[PDB]
Amino acid sequence: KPHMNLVVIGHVDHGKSTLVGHLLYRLGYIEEKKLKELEEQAKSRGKESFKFAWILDKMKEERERGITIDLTFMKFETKKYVFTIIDAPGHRDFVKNMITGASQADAAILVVSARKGEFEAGMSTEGQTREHLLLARTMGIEQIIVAVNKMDAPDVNYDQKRYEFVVSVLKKFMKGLGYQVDKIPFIPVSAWKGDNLIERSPNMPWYNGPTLVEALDQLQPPAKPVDKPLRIPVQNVYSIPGAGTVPVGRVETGVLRVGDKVVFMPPGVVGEVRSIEMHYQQLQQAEPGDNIGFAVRGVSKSDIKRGDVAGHLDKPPTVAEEFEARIFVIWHPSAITVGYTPVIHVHTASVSSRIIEIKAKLDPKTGQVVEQNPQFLKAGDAAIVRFKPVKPLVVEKFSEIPQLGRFAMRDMNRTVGIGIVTDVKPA
Amino acid sequence: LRTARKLRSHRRDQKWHDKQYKKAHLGTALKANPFGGASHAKGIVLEKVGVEAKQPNSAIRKCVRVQLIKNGKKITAFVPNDGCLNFIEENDEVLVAGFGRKGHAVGDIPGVRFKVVKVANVSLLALYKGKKER
RNA sequence: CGCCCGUCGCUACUACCGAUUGGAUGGUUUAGUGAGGCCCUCGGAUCGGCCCCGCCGGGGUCGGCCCACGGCCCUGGCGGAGCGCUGAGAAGACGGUCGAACUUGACUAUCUAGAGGAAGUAAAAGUCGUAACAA
RNA sequence: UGGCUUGUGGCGGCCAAGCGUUCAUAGCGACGUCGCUUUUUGAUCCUUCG
RNA sequence: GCGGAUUUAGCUCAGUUGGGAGAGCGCCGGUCUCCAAAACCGGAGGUCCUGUGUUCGAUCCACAGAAUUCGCACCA
């Protein structure tokens, strides 16, 4: 049964965690006694409507504020697939976390509230339906399902006109991003009631498409590049009684087996795999797509962090002394010059990088040079630029390992530009 | 031949006059230094202070005050190589060791009984010559 | 125009002294309290065997043509079912020695905080006087 | 104690050169001037040593 | 992960409310000397840590980074 990684994305409060939680529940992955206890705890803290969300949101600050802060990973299994599902935050402060999530994903569920004002807000200039869609594209997610959520809400009440309104807006925007919009399901659901999650909903007779589970089965599994050299960007590092220090991350390329000797770049520390675990099931090998924790003998937690990359010793992950990229500028309030230093979000990493030169401005559609060494770039421009990371950074050429070779540029907490790396000068 | 005990007792007691023997005899070695008799102690560079040489010799000597790990006590330490200052940064882990038998510092040095040999769990020789590390 | 002494002013580091009846640590502990097992006076949820009586079934003898029947010995079933006596036997419980642990203090051994007071040592030279070396 | 008076104490007030980044008064006000007050203190000797 | 401080001359620190910085040592240099010490003159020295926003103008504010620090959270 093929495995897939699913990221759940969308604007703050639109219903991401409630969807995932409620889906896991009616699919029977969550103990009724636990759902009962969560509900009681939720009511007693003034937050009844967070009972499904609190399956995913566990941190003290998440519960206090009623928001997701960082990623949660859950295994569930449909008729055709086994999914690792990744719950991502909508809050603008934590889009860096959502991005690491997208970097690990094969497909995305975009959760979009149909409630009056909630939709418009998410799709507004500085909204996260807009931003998350953009970032998901740049991190290389092609398969997308959209859950038009909260159909149950009184200000919505299962209205097909409201639904078709959000669908059309979403379609015009998504097509401008390069999505193949004709192929993607727009399912009207209620993460809270359950409508169209797993079974079909009587409240919405006018809807003929897949339910969300059906839409999942209609996805297609991605290429498994087992013959390219091992690369595992670390998403987090735990220190675990019995195991020791265990990096977690999704195997992008190559294969990893217990016994293997592995190196973590850019620090250059080397350890040896004691064990491998996916969703609490011990493994002996892990292949691309596997989202795993791997115990490492001889490595201290302080040696390694998120955004580090693990490969085998003979073909270690490339550390960029500098690198070259083709970029498009989504948004900027003035202009970008040589010297501009946004943070680069690539795979699980995020490191400020200085533009040391702008070799050429390109026509954004054709790719031809329109000017050698432009005096600056502005919103709407495309370019070939050189980048020097402020601290050691791992990147690969897009042509070689695309999952370590696509990136976003962010500055003053906004997404400014997008990029693919066309060349790397190794450290 | 029957007076053996006096000579036996006399020897051990007169022996107390040997200070090094005395040093082993009294639990002093364990408590006379921050180490506890230990050859090496990991530490942190609290500050870097330049110091002046003693007597006719005139020089600026590189000196570091170090906070020890288990001990938690102030230490006066000597920086050894030429431009080690360029390579010594505040709060980088440092391993320290002593000079020629415990007691007195090199005659040129003032109040330092300790030597700095590691930076960030890296030996000094490597930073000092270009071929090794940077 | 040689050596040489001490107070006094900087700067640093050791050790001595110390209002707080000073704080911290670990060992032996006086006394008051006392879990818990165990020996031991009991108790007695409960179980079985024989005691007495009546009724039938079956083996062996005696008084009866019988057959039922009665007596002895041995079992099966029912009532006074436990009503008479016996044995092992859980909860509990008398009084104990052992004796955790609690508290209250002791006491050693082992470090330690502090306004100030007082030496020294780095000690090259600032400032006062000539003590010692040539009666 | 009480009492005249209010220097001293306390409080408002006319004028607006200034603060208040632009501007005087939103919020404050030099100087200069009008006063209210009798829980401070002061001066006065009127009532109380028969 | 979150949140606070701090970063200004070779050194150590002061300023500030956006018109753009200021002192103590320094240390160096010269005179005297074998050379210093003392003495006496002389030195002009800062992307105000960085990007962006705002603005006519950003050392200063806002928003974002780095580095150092200090709280707090998380806990394979």
Next chain:
RNA sequence: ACAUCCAAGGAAGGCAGCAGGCGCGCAAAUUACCCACUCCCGACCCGG
């Protein structure tokens, strides 16, 4: 005296035995293969 999971009711534990995690530091390994050897333990085999 530590301290693990709590369906709120309870239930456990003594890795100073191999491995393996942490801690501690100046300072010491791997979550392996096996009864073939040396023995030993159970009853007349050949288990462990």
Next chain:
RNA sequence: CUGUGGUAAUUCUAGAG
């Protein structure tokens, strides 16, 4: 050993033949 049972959970374990 049959069957009949209770508990989040442990080498839990009743009652009945």
Next chain:
RNA sequence: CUGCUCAGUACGAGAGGAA
């Protein structure tokens, strides 16, 4: 006076935060 809903709301670029 305090709490529960009012409500992490309107108003904010946030910090925040009502009635």
Next chain:
RNA sequence: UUUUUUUUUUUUUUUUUUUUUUUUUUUU
């Protein structure tokens, strides 16, 4: 028998940093 012998201080504190250089047979 042969020898003393007075005199005595009226007035002299101090002197910065650093100082230096050494090694052998064999005769032509």
